[PDB]
Amino acid sequence: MKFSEKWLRSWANPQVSHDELVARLSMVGLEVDADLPVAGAFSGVVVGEVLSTEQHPDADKLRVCQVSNGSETFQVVCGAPNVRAGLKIPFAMIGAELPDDFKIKKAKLRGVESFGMLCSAKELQISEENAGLLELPADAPVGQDVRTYLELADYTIEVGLTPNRGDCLSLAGLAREVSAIYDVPLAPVAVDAVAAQHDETRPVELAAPAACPRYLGRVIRNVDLSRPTPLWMVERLRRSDIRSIDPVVDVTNYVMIELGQPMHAFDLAEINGGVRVRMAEDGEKLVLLDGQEITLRADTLVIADHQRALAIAGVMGGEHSGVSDSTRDLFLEAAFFDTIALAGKARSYGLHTDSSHRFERGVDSQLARKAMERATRLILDIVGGEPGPIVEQVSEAHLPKVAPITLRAERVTQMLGMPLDAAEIVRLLQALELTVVADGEGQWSVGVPSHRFDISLEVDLIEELARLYGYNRLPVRYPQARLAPNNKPEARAALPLLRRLLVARGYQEAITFSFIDPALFELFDPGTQPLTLANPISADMAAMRSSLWPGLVKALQHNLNRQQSRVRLFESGLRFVGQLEGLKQEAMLAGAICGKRLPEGWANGRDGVDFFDAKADVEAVLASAGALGDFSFVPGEHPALHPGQTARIEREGRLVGYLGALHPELAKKLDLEQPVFLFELLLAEVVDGHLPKFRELSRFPEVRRDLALLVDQDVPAQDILTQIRAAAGEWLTDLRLFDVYHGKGIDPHRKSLAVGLTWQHPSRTLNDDEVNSTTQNIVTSLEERFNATLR
Amino acid sequence: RYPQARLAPNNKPEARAALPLLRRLLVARGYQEAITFSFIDPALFELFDPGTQPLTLANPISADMAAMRSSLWPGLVKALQHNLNRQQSRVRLFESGLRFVGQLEGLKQEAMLAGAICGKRLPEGWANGRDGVDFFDAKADVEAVLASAGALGDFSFV
Amino acid sequence: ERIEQCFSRIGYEVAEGPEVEDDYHNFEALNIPGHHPARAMHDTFYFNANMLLRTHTSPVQVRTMESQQPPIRIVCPGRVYRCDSDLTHSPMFHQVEGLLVDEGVSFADLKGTIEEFLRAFFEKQLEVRFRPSFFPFTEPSAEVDIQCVICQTGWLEVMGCGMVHPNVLRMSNIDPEKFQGFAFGMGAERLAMLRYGVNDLRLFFDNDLRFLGQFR
Amino acid sequence: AAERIDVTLPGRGQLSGGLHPVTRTLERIEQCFSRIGYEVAEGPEVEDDYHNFEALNIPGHHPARAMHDTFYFNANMLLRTHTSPVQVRTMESQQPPIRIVCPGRVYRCDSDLTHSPMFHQVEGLLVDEGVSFADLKGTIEEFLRAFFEKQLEVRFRPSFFPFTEPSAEVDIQCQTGWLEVMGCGMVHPNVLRMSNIDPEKFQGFAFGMGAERLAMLRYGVNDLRLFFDNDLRFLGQFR
């Protein structure tokens, strides 16, 4: 909602500066988005009248004018194509200071004297019109300052209204606010009734009184549509961002922007047997004034006649029914349309109008009559004609009614944190035109005015009191809390903890989009149907991720393509598994690494990262809540990972996730020339750990024995170690794998595993005989299970 | 009953390396936390702090617990050798606590973070180098701690 | 993390929920009716007629209000999805949304909370301004401004809040006659940009190491 | 042809160490309170007889002040017997409300096998305009439930402390199936009076618990001497 400050001040003048007014507005819930002056500065420019024009005797493109300023006639030479006798135009006198430091001096143009200058809107910075001189009205006052006449000492204010303040979508609504805010007298436009010059009317039928409980119609005969819209109206609309189109639309727009009542005029000739306000029939077709051919639904209210639909009620008029060049007679319309009945209807046909907006947001249900009289006067003054009587069709039972609200002083005090005086409460609410009446001690009954559609509850009243008193003026308190000590279980690896671990372990945290390209999804998750969006932003953002890997791999290559060689990233977030019926939204921790194992340094090995570097990062995360033993890495396969270097991570047979090298075929497809190691973990399976259970320390030394073991190259080292613990006895305190050999020294289908076995008895020393007896039974067990041999 | 409290949101500054944070870093960086007695043997004190008069107790529990520590190093070195003498070869320890500097008139009680390391650089494993820990391994642990609140540049090793 | 800490220190619990929500928890239960323009496909990402990608973290507050009876002190951090994206807006962003429901909660209580949170977060004794605004789920509501101390009138809109609307409580079986409440919301990326001096919102989702490495 | 296959072999490099069981316990206690508005308060380990005794309603002739129980440097300077002097320093520096938790090293002379000459304790304090014994009972009962992660039975028995009145010894279930875990009580008026806090207007409660005691119950530790020995065979059990 944009408006002229001068126009608003003519109704309610707050008696403060422009800056003060623009400040207070945003501070009360009417946020000013823009405050611009209407024109550039200048002095000495007055309304002048061209008395005569002669052809310049020594220059064909020039004219020699005799111009009066109401006090004296001056000779002024002028080259404007539109300069002619009887023209009321801006006359810049000698001495006059025009925009961008332009001083008017005496001139002798081609041997002819000139005592001033005639101006165009551009030269005065009024408009961009430089085609010719600014032709002022025929009735303009000669001698009057052009700034005074054109009311150029003004600003335009743009307010970004909240959907609950549909009442401020007019100068009437906005002026009522200023009067409330500043406790200043409100001087509204006095709208006198226009007496009927004849008795010609058109019948009106309310076939859907629930959607339209009031409709006003008036016949206006023999209108001259060739006649122009006056400057004051054009300027007032222009200052509210409304383009002048034709007198009739300009009036119905002006009335809507002045009072807040959207209005419409039909060519009387186009109305076949009076108005029928009814719901549209399913598949009813209407061509709008813009040419759009709409196919209507039964839930839409239309303004029709006895033959066809004429317009979509409260939103837009039809082509056929509207005003044309042939139009001689009008039929004005001013109505109340129910907000509920109209809600979203314009949008459902892909439409949005100043009328649709206002009716949806709420138009004062009593206003139709005042607006109809206002539009009638303006129409007669602009295009002439003879007014008929007003036809008012109204359904009292369907008219909007808001039950009186009981406001309690205790509740105002409670909510505001401070008590307000009864006189203050009353004065404030009465300014908003609310009907406050005492209802015992510290309680009132308040009635809602016809323009407010947002007030119905006690809280809405308290809101208004808060708003007008001042939000920043209100007290500050900290809420009371009956708090008891509490804490989450000790043995748990929370995500904030796991993140900090990875940071310490040399990782950079990444955040990627949850919606990825379906082709990318398919690469990491083949044959899986992604959860696809109905309205994606683009096609490459249509699939909900089932893994954080695609997004991480992408961020990794984004960096690789940006002169980065060592990329170490991690992300936490949801994966989306399955379709809506059965959809799983599971929190994942994923990581991706490539490049050298260590950063570039004098003391650091130049070796590249491998599977076992990522495995240690995973091991560290799985050990975070003292439950590393509950996890097992088992040889696996994943469509996105290298089948020779893939580990399936499990806890009690349940899947935790995967750890492996990115599949070389996938790297090829993504143009990655480097080995990349990935891991993804179900956080739900990682969080729970175990609380320390103390086991008594022995006062006796530990015994260590080393075993070099030859086994099949393909037998997993974990299976061997598991079988060792199984045979090692109850005293084994530690078992370490310190070397793996696969070379020239032994058979090429075999491997030597160097294991260190540590034992400690809790109550005595261990003898060599028993320790050697244990060692031998461990060996015998490995000879029978994996056909192991000693090196 | 549970007491009533008119509480307001609050938080400590963002750019700060608090001790709980520094501890967890060292844990992640392969350290074991130690807690040693603040009162140490005067002979031990003198070894690490020569010429310095310790703040001595009038009634110590024993003579080897008569001097207030001016450094956490004696206590850490001791815990390190306690383990070394108990079949441990790789000892990585850290402690936080007060140091006591000067006599009662002018006594400074300052919170210190100390660490002590010995043995192989890495634990015994198939994929790990059998190299022993050196000065630059400890330097990295220090560097990591000094970088904790984005102010590593403010520090200089001279 | 920092926002969560300002509240978790004074009895607030961190609340989480699904990113793929239903129109009841996301809209209906938050006093957003069927015809409301926010519900439209121009602003909300949909899967079908009922299932969507959450526009805010407030549905977690609903799930909490349905599961338990007051007191309620929760903070809802998380990824949220808006359709209408450009350069100044991302189709995915993070926000923290708070809720307090107890037997005697005032607007002064909300004002106090917000003012002390912004001072704690921005680590300054900055000036905090409250302006009347509209939200369907809160009444009365406000837009919160802070000075241009952390760099047109030297005021910056940083968060929104308001007193929980009675219908919101009523819908989630909480009696508004007995219980009162306040809610607030703030943009994670917005706050991160003010604090760290980040100009381009697109830097966050690009994950360039030359950018990321600046927050060590 | 991608025969770059490998195993279930342990990862490369260093893994995480751990924290001391006492540090885990201190951290955990602090968290139960810091979540509900309590500030962590710290002070010096070498204190004066005023903050350590006089200000805590312990008079000159009191047996606790003697050299048989307290470590001294001279007549006025000593090693703190409790973390309560931090509460004094707080009460002197500020006016209520006060919600502080005081974790720290404390020193007792009379040591043996069941007692250490150095140990840790957390001591809490709440000072406000309407604090009751019901408030204290509620706080303690909910703290022990949170800490021990069980809905255990909490018993309060009348006891004596010079700085609190009325006072209690707090028991929890598991020879009578009850275990003395902490002490508490309402702050004595003379304590407040001495630190310029009017007892007519302000009331308060204080509590204390042994860090090693709690750590032993939680983790199943038998010997108190294990904590200060720092054996890796012990420490490594709390990773």
PDB file of N, CA and C in Angstrom, chain B residues 1-5 23-24 27-36 38 57-59 61 69 82-83 86 88 90 92 95-96 98 109 126-128, chain D residues 9-10 12-20 23 27 44-46 67 70-72 77 99 105 107 109 111 130 134-135 138-139 141 229-230 232-233 239:
ATOM      1  N   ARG B   1      10.035 -30.032  47.048  1.00  0.00           N
ATOM      2  CA  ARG B   1       9.764 -28.956  46.110  1.00  0.00           C
ATOM      3  C   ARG B   1      11.027 -28.747  45.279  1.00  0.00           C
ATOM      4  N   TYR B   2      10.904 -28.114  44.112  1.00  0.00           N
ATOM      5  CA  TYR B   2      12.030 -27.792  43.227  1.00  0.00           C
ATOM      6  C   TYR B   2      12.116 -26.278  43.186  1.00  0.00           C
ATOM      7  N   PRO B   3      13.269 -25.665  43.509  1.00  0.00           N
ATOM      8  CA  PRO B   3      13.318 -24.192  43.570  1.00  0.00           C
ATOM      9  C   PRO B   3      12.988 -23.460  42.273  1.00  0.00           C
ATOM     10  N   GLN B   4      12.297 -22.318  42.420  1.00  0.00           N
ATOM     11  CA  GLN B   4      11.896 -21.409  41.338  1.00  0.00           C
ATOM     12  C   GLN B   4      13.102 -20.574  40.905  1.00  0.00           C
ATOM     13  N   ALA B   5      13.235 -20.321  39.586  1.00  0.00           N
ATOM     14  CA  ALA B   5      14.356 -19.569  39.029  1.00  0.00           C
ATOM     15  C   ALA B   5      13.966 -18.736  37.811  1.00  0.00           C
ATOM     16  N   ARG B  23      41.357 -31.195  27.016  1.00  0.00           N
ATOM     17  CA  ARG B  23      41.493 -32.562  27.542  1.00  0.00           C
ATOM     18  C   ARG B  23      41.069 -33.574  26.498  1.00  0.00           C
ATOM     19  N   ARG B  24      39.892 -33.327  25.900  1.00  0.00           N
ATOM     20  CA  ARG B  24      39.273 -34.188  24.897  1.00  0.00           C
ATOM     21  C   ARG B  24      40.102 -34.245  23.646  1.00  0.00           C
ATOM     22  N   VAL B  27      43.000 -36.559  24.465  1.00  0.00           N
ATOM     23  CA  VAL B  27      42.445 -37.916  24.475  1.00  0.00           C
ATOM     24  C   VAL B  27      42.424 -38.410  23.015  1.00  0.00           C
ATOM     25  N   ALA B  28      41.804 -37.628  22.103  1.00  0.00           N
ATOM     26  CA  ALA B  28      41.744 -37.951  20.673  1.00  0.00           C
ATOM     27  C   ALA B  28      43.124 -38.097  20.043  1.00  0.00           C
ATOM     28  N   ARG B  29      44.105 -37.356  20.582  1.00  0.00           N
ATOM     29  CA  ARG B  29      45.486 -37.324  20.119  1.00  0.00           C
ATOM     30  C   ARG B  29      46.370 -38.385  20.795  1.00  0.00           C
ATOM     31  N   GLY B  30      45.719 -39.381  21.416  1.00  0.00           N
ATOM     32  CA  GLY B  30      46.345 -40.543  22.060  1.00  0.00           C
ATOM     33  C   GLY B  30      46.940 -40.414  23.454  1.00  0.00           C
ATOM     34  N   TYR B  31      46.362 -39.551  24.313  1.00  0.00           N
ATOM     35  CA  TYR B  31      46.856 -39.350  25.684  1.00  0.00           C
ATOM     36  C   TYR B  31      45.937 -39.897  26.761  1.00  0.00           C
ATOM     37  N   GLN B  32      46.553 -40.301  27.866  1.00  0.00           N
ATOM     38  CA  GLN B  32      45.881 -40.807  29.045  1.00  0.00           C
ATOM     39  C   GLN B  32      46.006 -39.753  30.134  1.00  0.00           C
ATOM     40  N   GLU B  33      44.879 -39.413  30.760  1.00  0.00           N
ATOM     41  CA  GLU B  33      44.873 -38.409  31.811  1.00  0.00           C
ATOM     42  C   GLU B  33      45.337 -38.966  33.144  1.00  0.00           C
ATOM     43  N   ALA B  34      46.216 -38.206  33.820  1.00  0.00           N
ATOM     44  CA  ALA B  34      46.756 -38.519  35.140  1.00  0.00           C
ATOM     45  C   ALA B  34      46.361 -37.456  36.175  1.00  0.00           C
ATOM     46  N   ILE B  35      46.232 -37.870  37.436  1.00  0.00           N
ATOM     47  CA  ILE B  35      45.994 -36.997  38.587  1.00  0.00           C
ATOM     48  C   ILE B  35      47.052 -37.384  39.633  1.00  0.00           C
ATOM     49  N   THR B  36      47.987 -36.455  39.921  1.00  0.00           N
ATOM     50  CA  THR B  36      49.090 -36.649  40.866  1.00  0.00           C
ATOM     51  C   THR B  36      48.904 -35.745  42.114  1.00  0.00           C
ATOM     52  N   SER B  38      49.542 -32.851  44.769  1.00  0.00           N
ATOM     53  CA  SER B  38      50.060 -31.483  44.655  1.00  0.00           C
ATOM     54  C   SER B  38      51.326 -31.288  45.495  1.00  0.00           C
ATOM     55  N   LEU B  57      55.115 -27.390  53.884  1.00  0.00           N
ATOM     56  CA  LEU B  57      54.114 -27.680  54.908  1.00  0.00           C
ATOM     57  C   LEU B  57      54.755 -27.795  56.293  1.00  0.00           C
ATOM     58  N   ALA B  58      54.040 -27.320  57.319  1.00  0.00           N
ATOM     59  CA  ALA B  58      54.477 -27.412  58.708  1.00  0.00           C
ATOM     60  C   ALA B  58      54.252 -28.847  59.193  1.00  0.00           C
ATOM     61  N   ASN B  59      53.095 -29.437  58.853  1.00  0.00           N
ATOM     62  CA  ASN B  59      52.724 -30.789  59.265  1.00  0.00           C
ATOM     63  C   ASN B  59      52.481 -31.758  58.080  1.00  0.00           C
ATOM     64  N   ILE B  61      52.182 -35.180  55.766  1.00  0.00           N
ATOM     65  CA  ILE B  61      51.749 -36.549  56.083  1.00  0.00           C
ATOM     66  C   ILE B  61      52.983 -37.450  56.220  1.00  0.00           C
ATOM     67  N   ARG B  69      54.038 -28.308  44.732  1.00  0.00           N
ATOM     68  CA  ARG B  69      54.565 -28.336  43.356  1.00  0.00           C
ATOM     69  C   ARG B  69      54.550 -26.961  42.658  1.00  0.00           C
ATOM     70  N   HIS B  82      56.532 -45.027  37.099  1.00  0.00           N
ATOM     71  CA  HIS B  82      55.724 -46.016  37.839  1.00  0.00           C
ATOM     72  C   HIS B  82      55.224 -47.108  36.869  1.00  0.00           C
ATOM     73  N   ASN B  83      54.808 -46.672  35.675  1.00  0.00           N
ATOM     74  CA  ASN B  83      54.328 -47.514  34.599  1.00  0.00           C
ATOM     75  C   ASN B  83      55.468 -48.254  33.895  1.00  0.00           C
ATOM     76  N   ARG B  86      56.491 -51.145  35.470  1.00  0.00           N
ATOM     77  CA  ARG B  86      55.367 -52.078  35.511  1.00  0.00           C
ATOM     78  C   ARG B  86      55.073 -52.656  34.122  1.00  0.00           C
ATOM     79  N   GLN B  88      55.409 -51.388  31.067  1.00  0.00           N
ATOM     80  CA  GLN B  88      54.827 -50.467  30.071  1.00  0.00           C
ATOM     81  C   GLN B  88      55.992 -49.839  29.326  1.00  0.00           C
ATOM     82  N   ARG B  90      55.245 -47.713  26.209  1.00  0.00           N
ATOM     83  CA  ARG B  90      54.688 -46.509  25.594  1.00  0.00           C
ATOM     84  C   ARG B  90      53.770 -45.817  26.603  1.00  0.00           C
ATOM     85  N   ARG B  92      51.976 -42.223  27.585  1.00  0.00           N
ATOM     86  CA  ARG B  92      51.517 -40.923  27.094  1.00  0.00           C
ATOM     87  C   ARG B  92      50.529 -40.389  28.118  1.00  0.00           C
ATOM     88  N   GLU B  95      48.154 -33.991  32.575  1.00  0.00           N
ATOM     89  CA  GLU B  95      47.530 -33.557  33.815  1.00  0.00           C
ATOM     90  C   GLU B  95      47.288 -32.044  33.745  1.00  0.00           C
ATOM     91  N   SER B  96      46.251 -31.605  34.431  1.00  0.00           N
ATOM     92  CA  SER B  96      45.915 -30.212  34.600  1.00  0.00           C
ATOM     93  C   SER B  96      45.802 -29.981  36.103  1.00  0.00           C
ATOM     94  N   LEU B  98      46.967 -26.850  39.561  1.00  0.00           N
ATOM     95  CA  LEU B  98      47.657 -25.661  40.036  1.00  0.00           C
ATOM     96  C   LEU B  98      49.143 -25.911  40.305  1.00  0.00           C
ATOM     97  N   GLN B 109      49.018 -19.057  42.508  1.00  0.00           N
ATOM     98  CA  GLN B 109      48.372 -20.361  42.308  1.00  0.00           C
ATOM     99  C   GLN B 109      47.797 -20.352  40.884  1.00  0.00           C
ATOM    100  N   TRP B 126      50.487 -53.741  12.693  1.00  0.00           N
ATOM    101  CA  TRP B 126      50.975 -54.241  11.411  1.00  0.00           C
ATOM    102  C   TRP B 126      51.283 -53.137  10.400  1.00  0.00           C
ATOM    103  N   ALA B 127      50.508 -52.029  10.460  1.00  0.00           N
ATOM    104  CA  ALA B 127      50.549 -50.880   9.549  1.00  0.00           C
ATOM    105  C   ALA B 127      51.368 -49.690  10.078  1.00  0.00           C
ATOM    106  N   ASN B 128      51.845 -49.793  11.328  1.00  0.00           N
ATOM    107  CA  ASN B 128      52.580 -48.748  12.039  1.00  0.00           C
ATOM    108  C   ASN B 128      54.107 -48.911  12.079  1.00  0.00           C
TER     109      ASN B 128
ATOM    110  N   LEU D   9      41.912 -56.209   8.751  1.00  0.00           N
ATOM    111  CA  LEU D   9      43.094 -55.806   9.499  1.00  0.00           C
ATOM    112  C   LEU D   9      42.858 -54.528  10.298  1.00  0.00           C
ATOM    113  N   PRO D  10      43.436 -54.400  11.508  1.00  0.00           N
ATOM    114  CA  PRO D  10      43.251 -53.149  12.271  1.00  0.00           C
ATOM    115  C   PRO D  10      43.752 -51.912  11.530  1.00  0.00           C
ATOM    116  N   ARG D  12      45.309 -48.029  10.789  1.00  0.00           N
ATOM    117  CA  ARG D  12      46.644 -47.464  10.938  1.00  0.00           C
ATOM    118  C   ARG D  12      46.676 -46.270  11.869  1.00  0.00           C
ATOM    119  N   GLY D  13      47.732 -46.218  12.665  1.00  0.00           N
ATOM    120  CA  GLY D  13      48.031 -45.120  13.560  1.00  0.00           C
ATOM    121  C   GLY D  13      47.567 -45.261  14.986  1.00  0.00           C
ATOM    122  N   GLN D  14      47.407 -44.092  15.589  1.00  0.00           N
ATOM    123  CA  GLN D  14      47.021 -43.861  16.962  1.00  0.00           C
ATOM    124  C   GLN D  14      45.504 -43.781  17.134  1.00  0.00           C
ATOM    125  N   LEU D  15      45.008 -44.351  18.231  1.00  0.00           N
ATOM    126  CA  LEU D  15      43.588 -44.258  18.577  1.00  0.00           C
ATOM    127  C   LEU D  15      43.461 -43.302  19.787  1.00  0.00           C
ATOM    128  N   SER D  16      42.273 -43.162  20.381  1.00  0.00           N
ATOM    129  CA  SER D  16      42.146 -42.235  21.505  1.00  0.00           C
ATOM    130  C   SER D  16      42.601 -42.854  22.809  1.00  0.00           C
ATOM    131  N   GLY D  17      43.058 -42.001  23.723  1.00  0.00           N
ATOM    132  CA  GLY D  17      43.442 -42.400  25.068  1.00  0.00           C
ATOM    133  C   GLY D  17      42.189 -42.371  25.915  1.00  0.00           C
ATOM    134  N   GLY D  18      42.231 -41.620  26.997  1.00  0.00           N
ATOM    135  CA  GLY D  18      41.066 -41.466  27.856  1.00  0.00           C
ATOM    136  C   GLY D  18      41.223 -40.429  28.944  1.00  0.00           C
ATOM    137  N   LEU D  19      40.137 -40.241  29.706  1.00  0.00           N
ATOM    138  CA  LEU D  19      40.113 -39.338  30.845  1.00  0.00           C
ATOM    139  C   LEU D  19      40.229 -40.143  32.143  1.00  0.00           C
ATOM    140  N   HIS D  20      40.600 -39.457  33.226  1.00  0.00           N
ATOM    141  CA  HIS D  20      40.700 -40.057  34.539  1.00  0.00           C
ATOM    142  C   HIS D  20      39.252 -40.267  35.063  1.00  0.00           C
ATOM    143  N   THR D  23      37.798 -37.262  36.758  1.00  0.00           N
ATOM    144  CA  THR D  23      37.479 -36.194  35.797  1.00  0.00           C
ATOM    145  C   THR D  23      36.101 -36.399  35.144  1.00  0.00           C
ATOM    146  N   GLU D  27      32.992 -33.901  35.829  1.00  0.00           N
ATOM    147  CA  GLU D  27      32.329 -33.370  34.648  1.00  0.00           C
ATOM    148  C   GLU D  27      30.817 -33.661  34.739  1.00  0.00           C
ATOM    149  N   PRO D  44      41.381 -20.674  45.138  1.00  0.00           N
ATOM    150  CA  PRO D  44      42.729 -21.208  45.438  1.00  0.00           C
ATOM    151  C   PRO D  44      42.707 -22.465  46.300  1.00  0.00           C
ATOM    152  N   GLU D  45      43.747 -23.314  46.173  1.00  0.00           N
ATOM    153  CA  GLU D  45      43.910 -24.538  46.974  1.00  0.00           C
ATOM    154  C   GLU D  45      44.602 -24.242  48.307  1.00  0.00           C
ATOM    155  N   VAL D  46      45.403 -23.160  48.327  1.00  0.00           N
ATOM    156  CA  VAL D  46      46.077 -22.647  49.518  1.00  0.00           C
ATOM    157  C   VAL D  46      45.215 -21.477  49.962  1.00  0.00           C
ATOM    158  N   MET D  67      45.981 -29.390  63.875  1.00  0.00           N
ATOM    159  CA  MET D  67      47.020 -29.914  62.991  1.00  0.00           C
ATOM    160  C   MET D  67      46.888 -31.424  62.752  1.00  0.00           C
ATOM    161  N   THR D  70      44.120 -30.792  59.692  1.00  0.00           N
ATOM    162  CA  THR D  70      44.406 -29.769  58.675  1.00  0.00           C
ATOM    163  C   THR D  70      45.901 -29.550  58.439  1.00  0.00           C
ATOM    164  N   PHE D  71      46.312 -29.499  57.158  1.00  0.00           N
ATOM    165  CA  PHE D  71      47.682 -29.209  56.728  1.00  0.00           C
ATOM    166  C   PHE D  71      47.900 -27.688  56.763  1.00  0.00           C
ATOM    167  N   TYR D  72      48.955 -27.229  57.428  1.00  0.00           N
ATOM    168  CA  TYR D  72      49.251 -25.805  57.575  1.00  0.00           C
ATOM    169  C   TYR D  72      50.596 -25.407  56.980  1.00  0.00           C
ATOM    170  N   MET D  77      47.697 -19.479  57.089  1.00  0.00           N
ATOM    171  CA  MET D  77      47.661 -20.155  55.791  1.00  0.00           C
ATOM    172  C   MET D  77      47.723 -21.670  55.899  1.00  0.00           C
ATOM    173  N   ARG D  99      23.969 -19.447  42.473  1.00  0.00           N
ATOM    174  CA  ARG D  99      23.779 -20.859  42.074  1.00  0.00           C
ATOM    175  C   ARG D  99      25.138 -21.301  41.578  1.00  0.00           C
ATOM    176  N   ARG D 105      40.301 -29.959  44.172  1.00  0.00           N
ATOM    177  CA  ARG D 105      41.184 -30.730  45.047  1.00  0.00           C
ATOM    178  C   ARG D 105      41.097 -30.167  46.453  1.00  0.00           C
ATOM    179  N   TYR D 107      42.307 -31.152  50.801  1.00  0.00           N
ATOM    180  CA  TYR D 107      43.360 -31.784  51.584  1.00  0.00           C
ATOM    181  C   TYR D 107      43.019 -32.015  53.040  1.00  0.00           C
ATOM    182  N   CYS D 109      44.494 -34.092  56.605  1.00  0.00           N
ATOM    183  CA  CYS D 109      45.709 -34.610  57.219  1.00  0.00           C
ATOM    184  C   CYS D 109      45.576 -36.100  57.511  1.00  0.00           C
ATOM    185  N   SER D 111      44.957 -39.351  56.955  1.00  0.00           N
ATOM    186  CA  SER D 111      44.904 -40.327  55.862  1.00  0.00           C
ATOM    187  C   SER D 111      45.276 -41.768  56.327  1.00  0.00           C
ATOM    188  N   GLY D 130      13.446 -17.165  48.797  1.00  0.00           N
ATOM    189  CA  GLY D 130      12.499 -18.068  49.454  1.00  0.00           C
ATOM    190  C   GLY D 130      12.860 -19.535  49.372  1.00  0.00           C
ATOM    191  N   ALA D 134      12.490 -28.306  51.655  1.00  0.00           N
ATOM    192  CA  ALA D 134      11.756 -29.076  50.653  1.00  0.00           C
ATOM    193  C   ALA D 134      12.443 -28.891  49.307  1.00  0.00           C
ATOM    194  N   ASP D 135      12.922 -27.649  49.055  1.00  0.00           N
ATOM    195  CA  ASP D 135      13.673 -27.250  47.866  1.00  0.00           C
ATOM    196  C   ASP D 135      14.980 -28.045  47.799  1.00  0.00           C
ATOM    197  N   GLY D 138      14.269 -31.848  47.270  1.00  0.00           N
ATOM    198  CA  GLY D 138      13.935 -32.031  45.860  1.00  0.00           C
ATOM    199  C   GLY D 138      15.145 -32.070  44.951  1.00  0.00           C
ATOM    200  N   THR D 139      16.061 -31.085  45.120  1.00  0.00           N
ATOM    201  CA  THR D 139      17.307 -30.910  44.363  1.00  0.00           C
ATOM    202  C   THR D 139      18.203 -32.149  44.476  1.00  0.00           C
ATOM    203  N   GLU D 141      17.537 -35.246  45.674  1.00  0.00           N
ATOM    204  CA  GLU D 141      16.863 -36.449  45.223  1.00  0.00           C
ATOM    205  C   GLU D 141      16.905 -36.548  43.683  1.00  0.00           C
ATOM    206  N   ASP D 229      47.753 -43.516  41.816  1.00  0.00           N
ATOM    207  CA  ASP D 229      48.845 -44.359  41.326  1.00  0.00           C
ATOM    208  C   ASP D 229      49.075 -44.174  39.823  1.00  0.00           C
ATOM    209  N   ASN D 230      47.981 -43.937  39.047  1.00  0.00           N
ATOM    210  CA  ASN D 230      47.976 -43.717  37.590  1.00  0.00           C
ATOM    211  C   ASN D 230      48.560 -44.905  36.784  1.00  0.00           C
ATOM    212  N   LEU D 232      48.385 -47.650  34.029  1.00  0.00           N
ATOM    213  CA  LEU D 232      47.687 -47.668  32.741  1.00  0.00           C
ATOM    214  C   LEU D 232      46.734 -48.855  32.629  1.00  0.00           C
ATOM    215  N   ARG D 233      47.017 -49.922  33.392  1.00  0.00           N
ATOM    216  CA  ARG D 233      46.159 -51.094  33.464  1.00  0.00           C
ATOM    217  C   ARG D 233      44.821 -50.744  34.160  1.00  0.00           C
ATOM    218  N   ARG D 239      38.114 -45.610  29.130  1.00  0.00           N
ATOM    219  CA  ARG D 239      38.184 -45.031  27.787  1.00  0.00           C
ATOM    220  C   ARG D 239      36.763 -44.930  27.138  1.00  0.00           C
TER     221      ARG D 239
END
